Nucleic acid binder design. Structure first.
Ligand SMILES: Nc1ccn([C@H]2C[C@H](O)[C@@H](COP(=O)(O)NP(=O)(O)OP(=O)(O)O)O2)c(=O)n1
Ligand SMILES: [Mg+2]
Ligand SMILES: [Mg+2]
Ligand code: NA
Ligand code: NA
Length: 327
DNA sequence: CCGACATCGCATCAGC
DNA sequence: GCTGATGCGA
DNA sequence: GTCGG
């Protein structure tokens, strides 16, 4: 029930997580540190020893050692040192630009480019995605109040039906889990003339419409089944301008619609725990189709599903509402 | 001691 | 020209 | 880094 309880520790693991991801390029250590931080964050006691923390799932030998040091000194020497290392701190920060991953960030820092200022000086060395992530650096780190999400949802739902009233658009992600604020907007899309069976420009025409009314402002990537870009709420004539926001639109076949709603509603860790738990209950689920495993796991055919708890029963879990799907 | 920890679409690079 | 590998964010 | 084969 508390961030403050073991906050010194959970911050330590979060920092260590980011450096593995961005500097050491180890996505699973990043995931491992996060898991440890999470379960420790829900632990309703103030941890007194590393042996005490090791008891929790996700916490093992090394993190136990790290906790002992922190508790008996108040610092982590490995972390103190990596904090003050110019190269490692520069690589880490640069990855906060959308489009710049660990590879490119390491590349830029190697040739002397270490700040936003240096980036804004070297546009020739940037792909289109990166120029936009740089441009809207501040805004993309701002959270979106649910009030604005509802306003955003209004424009989207309106223009979708305006193109063709047989479309269905569902706003998923954290917004659908009911969160008070979101980091971006996720839009699920479907149309009767697109199933797992076979109208050519379904995604293009929705996007084209949203650009027409000046909702979508930039395009990070776009194809037949998926769009990633930037959007903006129009301002009140006297009042100031809104931040540019990240938006993703994806086109999913209608006959697989609900599995997509489940997945893109999330959450992140929740989907990992469902697909890790299907493999022990003789199932295997992705964003398209839950399939009943065979004996050695030979994957049967795509079942029917006409609501989200259909899936929860196949897998035999209690139907948790979206608001309870953080993990 | 050692591999799994999920897989996806799209931009861009490596190379025939 | 093309296919495939990689990086990236989800 | 953690878990389990
Ligand atoms: N790595 C990831 C990231 C997201 N997802 C699914 C669950 C996420 O809810 C859904 C959308 O990703 P997302 O926008 O990045 N996260 P989410 O919407 O949950 O929260 P926010 O960042 O928006 O606030 O993707 C996933 O399965 N694996
Ligand atoms: Mg979201
Ligand atoms: Mg998103
Ligand atoms: Na443990
Ligand atoms: Na980034």
């Amino acid at each position: 029930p508390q961030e403050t309880l073991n906050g010194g520790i959970t911050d330590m693991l979060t920092e260590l997580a980011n450096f593995e991801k961005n500097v050491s390029q180890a996505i699973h250590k990043y995931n491992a540190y996060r898991k440890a931080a999470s379960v420790i964050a829900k632990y309703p006691h103030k941890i007194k020893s590393g042996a005490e923390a090791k008891k929790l799932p996700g916490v093992g030998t090394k993190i136990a050692e790290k906790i002992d040091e922190f508790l008996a000194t108040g610092k982590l020497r490995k972390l103190e040192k990596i904090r003050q290392d110019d190269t490692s701190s520069s690589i880490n920060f640069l990855t906060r630009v959308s489009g710049i991953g660990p590879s490119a960030a390491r590349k830029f820092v190697d040739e002397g480019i270490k700040t936003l200022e240096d980036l804004r000086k070297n546009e020739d060395k940037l792909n289109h995605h990166q120029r936009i992530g740089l441009k809207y650096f501040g805004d993309f780190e701002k959270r979106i109040p649910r009030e604005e999400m509802l306003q955003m949802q209004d424009i989207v739902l309106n223009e979708v039906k305006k193109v063709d009233s047989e479309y269905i658009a569902t706003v998923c992600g954290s917004f659908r889990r009911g969160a008070e604020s979101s980091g971006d907007m996720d839009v699920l899309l479907t149309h009767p003339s697109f199933t797992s069976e076979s109208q050519p420009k379904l995604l293009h025409q929705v996007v084209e419409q949203l650009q027409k009314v000046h909702f979508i402002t930039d395009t990070l990537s776009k194809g037949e089944t998926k769009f990633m870009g930037v959007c903006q709420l129009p301002s009140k004539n006297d009042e100031k301008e809104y931040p540019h926001r990240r938006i993703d639109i994806r086109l999913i076949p209608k006959d697989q619609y609900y599995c997509g709603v489940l997945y893109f509603t999330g959450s992140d860790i929740f989907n990992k725990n469902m697909r890790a738990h299907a493999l022990e209950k003789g199932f295997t689920i992705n964003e398209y189709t839950i399939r009943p495993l065979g004996v050695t796991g030979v994957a049967g055919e795509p079942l029917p599903v006409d609501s989200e708890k259909d899936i929860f029963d196949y897998i035999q879990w209690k139907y948790r509402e979206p608001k309870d799907r953080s993990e």
